[PDB]
Write a structure and sequence with these properties.
- Disulfide bonds join 10-30, 15-35, 19-37.
- This protein is an alpha+beta fold and 40 residues long.
- It has 1 helix and 3 strands; from the N terminus they run βαββ.
- The protein has one helix spanning 16-23, and strands at residues 4-9, 28-31, 34-37.
- The protein has a 3-stranded antiparallel beta sheet with strand order 1-3-2, with helices on one face.
- Strand 2 and strand 3 form a beta hairpin.
Length: 40
């Protein structure tokens, strides 16, 4: 997968704003306890 993995914890909920900070794109998802971010 081309998801961008991060060190930011989550137990559900939005990762969009976290991803704005992490990768500069306000898109992502909580997967298995951490945020991933989407750049296309």
């Amino acid at each position: 997968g081309s998801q961008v993995q991060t060190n930011v914890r989550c137990q559900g909920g939005s990762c969009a704003s976290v991803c704005r900070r992490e990768i500069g794109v306000a898109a992502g998802r909580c997967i298995n306890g951490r945020c991933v971010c989407y750049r296309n």
